[PDB]
Amino acid sequence: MQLTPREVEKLMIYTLSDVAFKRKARGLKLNYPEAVSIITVTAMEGARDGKSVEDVMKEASKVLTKDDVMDGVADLIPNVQVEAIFTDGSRLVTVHDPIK
Amino acid sequence: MQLTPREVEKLMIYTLSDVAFKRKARGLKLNYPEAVSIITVTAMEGARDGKSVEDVMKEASKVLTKDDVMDGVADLIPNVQVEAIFTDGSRLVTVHDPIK
Amino acid sequence: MQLTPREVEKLMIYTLSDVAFKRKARGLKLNYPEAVSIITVTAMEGARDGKSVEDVMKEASKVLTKDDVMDGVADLIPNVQVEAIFTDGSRLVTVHDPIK
Amino acid sequence: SEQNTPLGGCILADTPITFNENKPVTKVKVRNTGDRPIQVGSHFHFFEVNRALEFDRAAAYGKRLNISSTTAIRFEPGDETEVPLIPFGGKQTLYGFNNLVDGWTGEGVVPNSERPDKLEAIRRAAERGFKS
Amino acid sequence: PQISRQEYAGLFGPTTGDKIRLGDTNLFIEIEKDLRGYGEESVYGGGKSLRDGMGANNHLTRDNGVLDLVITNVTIVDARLGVIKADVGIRDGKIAGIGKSGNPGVMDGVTPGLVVGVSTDAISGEHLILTAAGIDTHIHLISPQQAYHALSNGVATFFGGGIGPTDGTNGTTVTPGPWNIRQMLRSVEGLPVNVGILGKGNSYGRGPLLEQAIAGVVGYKVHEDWGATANALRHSLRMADEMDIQVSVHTDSLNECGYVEDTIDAFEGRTIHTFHTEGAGGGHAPDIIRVASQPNVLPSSTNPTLPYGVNSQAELFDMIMVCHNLVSFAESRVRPETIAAENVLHDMGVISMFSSDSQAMGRVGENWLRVMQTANAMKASRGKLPEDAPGNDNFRVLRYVAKITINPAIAQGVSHVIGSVEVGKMADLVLWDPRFFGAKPKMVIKGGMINWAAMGDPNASLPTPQPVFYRPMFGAMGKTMQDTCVTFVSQAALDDGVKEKAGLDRQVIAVKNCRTISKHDLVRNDQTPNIEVDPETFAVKVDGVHATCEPIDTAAMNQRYFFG
Amino acid sequence: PQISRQEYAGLFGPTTGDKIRLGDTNLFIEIEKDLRGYGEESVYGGGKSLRDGMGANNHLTRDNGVLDLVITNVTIVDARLGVIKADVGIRDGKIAGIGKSGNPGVMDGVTPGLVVGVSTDAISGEHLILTAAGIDTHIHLISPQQAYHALSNGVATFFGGGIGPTDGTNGTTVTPGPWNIRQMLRSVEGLPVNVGILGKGNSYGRGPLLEQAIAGVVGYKVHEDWGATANALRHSLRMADEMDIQVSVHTDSLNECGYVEDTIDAFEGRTIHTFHTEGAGGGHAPDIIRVASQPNVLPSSTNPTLPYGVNSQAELFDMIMVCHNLVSFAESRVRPETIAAENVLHDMGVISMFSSDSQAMGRVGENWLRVMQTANAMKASRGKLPEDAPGNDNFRVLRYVAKITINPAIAQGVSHVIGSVEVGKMADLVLWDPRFFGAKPKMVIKGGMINWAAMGDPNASLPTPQPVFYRPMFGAMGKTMQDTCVTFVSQAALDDGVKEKAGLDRQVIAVKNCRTISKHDLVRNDQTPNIEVDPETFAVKVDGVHATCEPIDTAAMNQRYFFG
Ligand code: NI
Ligand code: NI
Ligand code: NI
Ligand code: NI
């Protein structure tokens, strides 16, 4: 499969978000790492799905709420950034104030 | 997410236990690594869920049976130890004779 | 669990195939890495399940079709090779022209 | 048998192990006169154990407990126990511990007298506070 | 002109009178002093002040004392300087100045030595806390990977011993004998932390001690496991005084050759470092804690009992019973009463240092975390320390910081080179985001270079994109890793040519000032009260006052921050 | 006093007459001899015997011959010493003694040289098996990472060649020429295994051979891929005898310049090492196996055919057909009859060594695993070897162990320094849990330091908490990794200053005793019978007896133990 360092690194994201999505579904309020994971993968998966940067951005800024996170985590996540592989290439996605 | 070496290391556990739980659900009798994985994550997840060391210990000593493992594996797993992150901090959990 | 380098390496496969199987189930057409992942794990899991090299080979040469992959990926995957742990030991599995 | 041994298991023979067989045994009576537990191991120079232990210290000169290597005896507060004592081997040269001897603990060559370095030791115990 | 605080802060961070919350704790620090004026504020960027001929000098060569690095507009939390806002300057891997940085051509009030120039790089400290890097005095050299866990919590110096995962190392902080020492000196060349090694103290004559001294140790470790005898103590300390090196102790838990009082007498008023002073980690049962009353004792605790929590007794019980492959040794070893007492004594300034006991009952990557966790649990239970100021927690915080910084240094005789943010010292520094204070640092600066950092995708268009995880940096690379790291040794060794003999490329620095020190030389933790322990109920009285507190359910800087 | 065996064992492990199960196999080893008396048993711990002035000497400096390390109460499984219970002692990275360790001041019967002291560290061998580290004679230098897979199965010495993933390396164990050799010597400095390099043997005059000899090779590899000609052989062997180095061969599979008999004649009764002697991995088809009858041949098999299983034919078929990017070459190359025969001949002591053929048809991390797997399949099919003792499998086990330990060493002329647990040898040792024997070691001891180990969470309060995975240790770190590792070379090279010229920091040791050896010098595998192969049906007869066994369905030490 000839995995490059960038490809391998992204496996960490996938593993932490799977754990995170399981936890959220048990009703656990998420922590910092977990929450960052879910927003990150949402973007990443959008990219793969063929969406625009603009569109994924919206999507990712809406996946998590204040209720879904542990008190204060918002303050820890002002923005999330990830590079994803869009149809037109690799692109930076910033997601502004994702926990509303 | 500012993942520390301890955080990253724990992703291995999560990945092997997911595989292990899939296998057990197919009716496969588990091996050594797989079985150790399931006990370990049970503890870890308890910790996260807010339980006591005492309580997680019980829980983890009960997840796997002799039937659920390959003959002899018990002899290979006298105890399992993991550090988990409890409400009051990181704590060592020993699970005594988990395969009964 | 006393994980050896060979054991640890195989976690990458498990992580990428989980992502890949999720994508295929959304109707996404798979790419090169993803497709190689699914064929690889099919073999690996067969091995674990107790099948023969011969039998797993068949199984793995049938999991993915031309339709299930992105145009051209076939040309990128003439064969897939993996070492799996069979009842009689570690064995090389070559899977010939898996995307038919 | 072989058919029943666990993975990595041992099949042990029957014959008991006999240790320290040649060595002459002195029984002493030990009372813990402190408020805290005292525990002593197999190779410690019994003579030089915790000041708070009251026993015939002279009798423990050059001696160790006649127990299994690596094991110990626990002396709880205000309890009395009899213990078996045996001499050290080799050269009977004892350095360190509480700095009571820092030498040779052997009998020497004269049956029905004591060496003077032993009597020195014993006197020194007494005035360093080592209860007899 | 006139600007609002809120607008000022946004540009430059907090100034004198402004208060900062240390994480999710209830600790609030306050800026005492602002050393960097107003209106001439040095910041790196496009269209900003540290540009050529403006804030930066553009005509001076480096030999005019121009800086190699500047950290701007930073909040300094240090046990000797306090809580200040300043520019910090580095030259030749050393702290040259704390004050106002810039260009004296165009600026008033530039601190001498803080000339920014052609030579200068920059770090933006505006929204950051700068600390001294921590120092871990109780390291078991079981695993080389510990170093990474340490750097990742803001620790950059290791004192201890071992030889990898041998049964002796698993239990003690000893590197026994001249062969093993040499080996270990050579090995640590591969590590991105400062190191000093400890030797085996349990010896009858001078010979066997001197041996190890010359071979390069900084200390002798006296452990029960190899014999914690009066003899051991006595000869170890006598040698120490000869060699200007330290002695650390793990006392007899069984009371075999004596009680605590007899141990005390074996010290013979000589300077000594006492590990896990409480006893859960080893020591004269129930009452090793009484050594914290003595002026010659430099006391430490290992980090698994701090803070005291609801799961603490369960954990420890079970831990020993496996540590020692084992019940009346157990419930005498593990005492709720003395554990609580340890917590209180910390808060009082009676136990002077935190330590890990790495992979021998404590957590190498949790010393900065646990310190903060303890301060905060204790504020809750006790309130304000009497010496606190009403609006802030500075007195407190600073007590705690001394514990992982300057106090360890002083104990091992390296405060001349490391442990505080002070002029003339090695730049061994940590940068933190307040939001993450104690837990998750930004970077580690190791000998004037960034050695370790939280870094995301190296392929990305920025340094911040995910996944962000701790990674070595250039100071951690090549020949620079050795250049920027110190191997501490004995003067004896230094003088005998250890550097040549052993073939070390590390900086090799002689320990000094270990034997003339006492408890009162310790910073913010200089208290010697009367300590009494009840041999029945294990209750602790400190100047006649029962020393207890209640366990915490919830730790700060804990499950919010960590996946671990 | 008197103590029960069961109680004794629990304290000290098994003694003379006690039997140990090697994993999940049906092999049972029995302790032949107990060298460490009764009643004065040396154990490390709190309240135990190896304390100051008691089991440990506290007055002797190291130059009195005090140990650097001691491994206590351990079961030694070695092809020359047999199955014994002893204390093992290490000094100056060498085995100083096997016997009773302690303090002669206070103890009777301390083996000379086994004085435990101030210098000494300790390993608790009570419930452990100690082996010599394995030696892999057939390494393709395709990937540097192989070393890690090897250490993780108890192999610590590599013999072979290559230059990374070139097509020549993918097929052969050759490092061709003075430039490539130099390069490769320099590279391996970065590896935590011992190494000796092989050169290209296919040459017409002395010139091209001599050149590589001086450059530092330990051997010449004669391969079909570069020409396995009579010429090659002849000149290679003549040079070898001159240089005191070894020759290894991969014969002509196509029968182009000859049949096996002609190859044999090309050897010209000269000492030679024959790789994959069966032929699945290469060689004169169908009948290369007949070389195992000759006294000058030191035979080896590669590990993918051992043990013979139900999936073995399917695998191998398909493998060649990709190895050679390809059917009458195939079904002539891959012969069930000769594969079975290989298995039997192993059990007889007719094939003398196991090897990997790393990433050129075999498995670098499975030599210790497969050896044990083979012994156990063979016990099942054949029963007890005639020389076995009725109650135990010692004779057998020990045959097999020789295969990965002493026999390889002897073949490559390094038995003077490595391959057995014997006094005066380099401490290249492996520790195993019986439960995991062959499969998953505890640790590797590499030049007297622990280089590699199964280690859990470096942040944890113990070394055992999860995840446990194989990790480098301090012997694998810094300048010690070179100090503790050997680069084997030719005497020619050594004498020419290879160490200076090439700038090597490794230990550089001359190979010796390669050319005077024969099959009969091999340990427990010294049999030279008549071997006949049927050119139609490929059936093998050994002294007129059909040599076959049936394939296994289920391997031991296999799916129970491994996720891989
Ligand atoms: Ni300790
Ligand atoms: Ni310790
Ligand atoms: Ni070959
Ligand atoms: Ni080969």
Author numbering:
A (entry chain D), B (entry chain A), C (entry chain W): 1 to 100
D (entry chain B): 31 to 162
E (entry chain F), F (entry chain C): 2 to 327, 335 to 572
What does the original paper state about this entry?
Ureases are nickel-metalloenzymes produced in plants, fungi, and bacteria, but not in animals. They facilitate nitrogen fixation by metabolizing urea, but in some pathogenic bacteria they serve a dual function and consume ammonia to promote survival in acidic environments. Y. enterocolitica urease comprises three polypeptide chains (ureA, ureB, and ureC), an architecture similar to that of K. aerogenes urease and has been biochemically characterized previously. The active site contains two Ni2+ ions which are coordinated by six different amino acids.
We have determined the structure of a dodecameric urease assembly, a metalloenzyme from the pathogen Y. enterocolitica at an overall resolution of 1.98 Å using cryo-EM. The structure shows that Y. enterocolitica urease assembles into a dodecameric hollow sphere with a [[αβγ]3]4 oligomeric assembly structure of tetrahedral symmetry. The homo-trimer is arranged in a tetramer-of-trimers making the full complex a dodecamer of the hetero-trimer. There are four large oval shaped holes between the trimers (64 Å long, 12 Å wide, high electrostatic potential) and four smaller holes at the center of the trimer with a diameter of 6 Å (low electrostatic potential), as shown in Fig. 2b, and the center of the enzyme assembly is hollow. A tightly embedded kinked loop is interacting with neighboring domains and is potentially responsible for the assembly of the oligomer. Furthermore, the high resolution allows for a detailed description of the nickel-metallo-center and the active site. The active site is located on the ureC protein at the edge of the hetero-trimer and is wedged in between the ureA and ureB proteins of the next hetero-trimer in the homo-trimeric assembly. Ni(1) is additionally coordinated by His224, His251 and His277 and Ni(2) by His139, His141, and Asp365. The mobile flap of the cryo-EM structure presented here is modeled in an open position, however the local resolution is lower than in the surrounding areas, indicating flexibility. The distance between the Ni2+ ions is 3.7 Å in X-ray structures of K. aerogenes and S. pasteurii, but only 3.2 Å in the Y. enterocolitica cryo-EM model. Finally, we noticed that radiation damage can partially explain the shorter distance observed between the nickel atoms in the active site, possibly by a stronger ferromagnetic interaction after deprotonation of the bridging hydroxide molecule.
